[model samples]
Target: VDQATLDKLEAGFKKLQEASDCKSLLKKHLTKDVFDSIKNKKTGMGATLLDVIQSGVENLDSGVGIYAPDAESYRTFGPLFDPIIDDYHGGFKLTDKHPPKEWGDINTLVDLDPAGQFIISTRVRCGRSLQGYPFNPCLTAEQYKEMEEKVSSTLSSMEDELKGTYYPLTGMSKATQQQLIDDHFLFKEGDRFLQTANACRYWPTGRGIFHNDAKTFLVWVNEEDHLRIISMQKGGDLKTVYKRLVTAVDNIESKLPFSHDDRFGFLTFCPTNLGTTMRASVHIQLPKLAKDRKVLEDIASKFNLQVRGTRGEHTESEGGVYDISNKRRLGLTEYQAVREMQDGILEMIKMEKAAA
Candidate 1:
């Protein structure tokens, strides 16, 4: 490491030590001993400890507060990432292994809200990184463009319901982009957390969205991960939604290789998303139950589900609509993750009905 970079890291560590209220997992586990141990480490891609911890140091209010600048950061910085992953993923210890990929019979799944009274929509999504490339922070401008081209071409060739158009964020009009965001078809720009992590460099240079004509199937290229495969639609036909996601994932995998590890099912920039890297969620309304947030949360915990706002994490619910999904991602198979969401939502619906 250079003297100038070491000086900057020293200053950053000093600030972290002074922030008494910082509750990020990074702060909780980053002891003086741990810092000294990992300070000089760098990945094969030249990613430093600073590259991995800078986001957390800059955003003290962050939840997990750390990102793997590249896939190798997970191993190169294992001393720090291991415990954080264990804590955030609910006891997925360093010795524990993530189960191999499995998509059980999709027909076994059933809808949660057939009458359409509670659920507004059902969506299942997962993040995948193309093999042979470093993550966002370590990627060059040319790498971004090259990856986008590879991903867009692969997606464009998909036939039937999986067929879609790739709309590059570059040269896109503001009004058109806003419409996509408003409709929840695109990701928002200028995430301060990602910016501090150095993950948002060369913004929108290779970013784009690809969706089928029905928009029920989509792929987000160059987002938080290399690709975010999504399948969603209105109402609570989880069976249909999950089936579509499985089909799309299978089709894409045949054409592109994804980064995976024996211990961590599918590798991602964030440790929390390591295993299945899948989030199967539904936008639901439970007016009576939602009136008391504690009551709703308590119930969700029992089912191993997480509650978020309608627009997703860190946003407020609109009109009592809540986004609920499976909580555990690692140490489990892909089929098990979706099953958790299905089973949990059913329990929530029953409670909502019983509520006064």
Candidate 2:
């Protein structure tokens, strides 16, 4: 390694050690032995240990603090990533395998808020990475543009409600972009975590948003992942929302091959998002239940749900509205991941009524 790179790694280690209050899994699991063992290793894409750990080293406040620069980083840096994955995915160990894909029966799921009282909207989203392409950090500008063309063309051929227009982030007007963001139809740019991880190298070259006329079904191209397929709608009709997502996923799968593994199910840039890579969530107003943050979190934990602010992680809950979703993705099927969120939301609604 070059002197500058070695110096950076040393500084990062020192900072992580001194940040005594930081609870990031990177800091917790990156022991001297683990670091020394994996530090010299490099992935086939030429991604080194520095590329894998730089994000976490830069962002001490991160919850997980690590990202896979490429698929091989999972193997090359297995000792550091395995435990973090296990902890984040609720005991999904290195040996535990993720189950096959299954949509189950969307008909079995009912609306959590029939009266539209507490539930504002329901959304089910999943990430997909195209086969043969490396994750974001390893993608070149040409690769980004090529992927965008391929994805946009595939999306344009959709029929029925799944049909949508692709809006390239490169030429989009700021006003239109802001409006889309405000309506939650578009993904915001990467934050410090992704920036430090070298995941935003090509910027907007291969990035775009595709959504149907109603904006209920959407796909993000080259965001954190190659594609973030989403289905959502106003009100609490989770069945419809989930069904839309399932249909879109099936349709996309028929056209483009995705990166998958026998153990990880679907490969992603982050260990926390492995397996199903699905996050079925709702924008819920739980004023009574949320009166005490701790109490709300405790109830959420009981159901294996994660409660984030209204906008998303790191944001603050607004006017009693919070984003609640399934926490465990790895080691489970797609159907099971959504079911966990559905069941948890139902329970929370019941508790909300009791609180009232």
Candidate 3:
């Protein structure tokens, strides 16, 4: 980012950092394009919510928000939703289903049929080439997944907390149905997760339709530019999600699939999914410990991430920078996997003899 933008970011974050009580901050930036995209019935959350969140986000990579969806929505029909996810194998983008580099004729997708009551969803890939932020570009899928796991798990906890209150239907909001959802999940804590000054970004927030006869929830997302489809059964948590995501490296090691004409890749529906993306983040108030160098050092040592004073640039041309992530235990919630990131970040904040 230009120094002007850099200063702008620092200035904004400085205030964010200084605030002792705030637990969540929406990093604002160019989101109208995204908002507009979601509005098109052809594709978008705007179409679903009918409401719009026009606010911007923080510095690139400095995501700020909390997101969550229903658990049963995913766990039930995971078998059918593979294709929509495969498109997002590497990143969240808008797209139509195109088979992985070469699974062009696999029977893996035979189970899904739009004729049934299907739920619709979108995945927003939010990372950009940050300016002055420390980054390590992954020439390989393994490299990306390794780092992604660290980042993904960190925010899962906070987002999990908000699941109770996130919008659940895709099309028009059903007052009766929504009321049931609200009564079931909505509470003061759910309110806190959304209102807190947490710092994290979520791109793949989804909207699903609930149909009883079909007993299926269809979900979709924009991957790169195409649309991909995936359906799940009507039930609890999706299985082997996080662990399944970490397996891409093995596919690469064994030369199993997804390696292609241009990209040396592993075939995966969830490139980094681990079966969980609905996430949330909170920037731990750090000024209290800023005065204690040892506390900072201890945190850096405890969590397997770096902590530098400022933000980093995105493109390689920019140069290396430092940041901290993968701390979730500090904030626990549904889907145990996500809590890790929150804990990791909280570890960075050195509270005098506080119990974890």
Candidate 4:
């Protein structure tokens, strides 16, 4: 092999070693399906949320849409979401205009189609990644029987611990859900039961295929129809957000591991479209913070982020939304990327004297 390509391989191997630490992050970001598509699997590197966003800021004045100028590093800054979010026809409301009496309560529950095909989603709140204690869903297809069996044994061995961790529910034992902690934590990977304090539900009904209440995320029927992500009022705290996102990854690591053989995919968009590419992007408005050009530049130099074109090219505003899009390495998981984004965004906000 040529020196350059050989050099590339060496550098890549080092990064792969580093990425191993974020296995959980890998499932959270790449999902299982997305990472599996990369063919040879691009190795991660010196890339960090700090470096990716910092590099963007370094050269942002040149007008490269969040994609990194370096093709090699371009993978670091994959895509932007603000415009996509604006254009997203998916029905979701950022804030709740209509409040339900209880949070995580379901207006509708799921039922199988006449053909008897469906998926059961179960969620928990307290993982290093995940959105809620019970908003996440677990699938119980016949294919997952083996994994379920292993889990049953694991939980049974830890029943008292599960009870100490979570409240017992229909499907799972309480002691198991309480694994890592006593009954104080929200959900346990071992505990399959739903939590009482969570704000999740199966989902919107009338689609005639899947039903989502506080217990599940989506459903599939006779391989025909699909459900959608309903942007609700409050997804929850930072931990909840990460937990939600990671729950998607955990499923991949278990059921699919970047392979869609089951016809079930948790995540869709990524460089490789692997359900768990361990990469994620977040857009934050920085107009007030960007007001001080020199201050922004200095901070940009420090963390390595960019300041570029206004919020919208398609937007009506002259500069559009002054924003910062960042990428961080959780190493093979979206959590590292998203978690870093969450932390960075909060820091960036405080930079502008935000109360948040």
Among the numbered candidates, top TM-score falls to 2
Q: After superposition, how far is residue 168 of candidate 3 from its true place, in Å?
A: 13
TM-score (C-alpha) between model 1 and the true structure = 0.95
Give me the runs in candidate 4 sitting further than 4 Å from their true place.
1-236, 257-283, 291-325, 329-335, 354-356
lDDT of 3 by residue, 1-356 (tens): 13454444345444544555543323231123433332222112111111111111232232233121111212222221222233222222233232222211222212221232211111111111111111121113343333333323322232221111122223334565455333221111122222221211121222222222221211112121111122223211123222222222222223211112112111111222222222222222344444444455466555433343222112121122123333221111123323333345434432522524
Per-candidate Cα lDDT values, in order, are: 0.88, 0.89, 0.26, 0.27
For candidate 1, lDDT tens digit of each residue in 1-356? 67777887888889888999988899988888888988888888888988888898999988888899888888888888988888877778777999878988887887577788998889999999989998899999999999999999999899999988999998689999988887777988988888998888999999999999898999999989999999999889988898899999999999999999999889888887888999999999988889966677788988888888766776778888889999888988889999999999988889889888
Listed in order, each prediction's TM-score against the native is 0.95, 0.97, 0.23, 0.28
TM-score of 2: 0.97
- What RMSD, rounded to one decimal, does every model reach? 1.7, 1.3, 19.6, 20.3
Q: In model 1, which residue pairs have backbone atoms overlapping below 3 Å?
A: none
lDDT of candidate 2 over 1-356, digit per residue (tens): 55677777778888899999999999999998898888777777888888888998888899899999899898889999899988888887667889888889777886577788898888999999999999999989999999999999999999999988999998899898888987877988767888899988878788899999999999999989999999999888888888889889999999999999888889999888898999999999988899976788899988999988877887788888889999999988788899899999998989888886
Q: Please, what are the lDDT tens digits per residue for candidate 4 over residues 1-356?
A: 24454454344334433554333222123322332333132214333222222212232221221221122333333222112221221211233121111212122222212221110111222111111111122222331333323333322332221211112223334454344123111212221111111111232111111212332222221111111211111222334433443443244234322222111122222212222222222223456655565656467435433333332121222232333323222112333334333445456655655522
lDDT of 3: 0.26
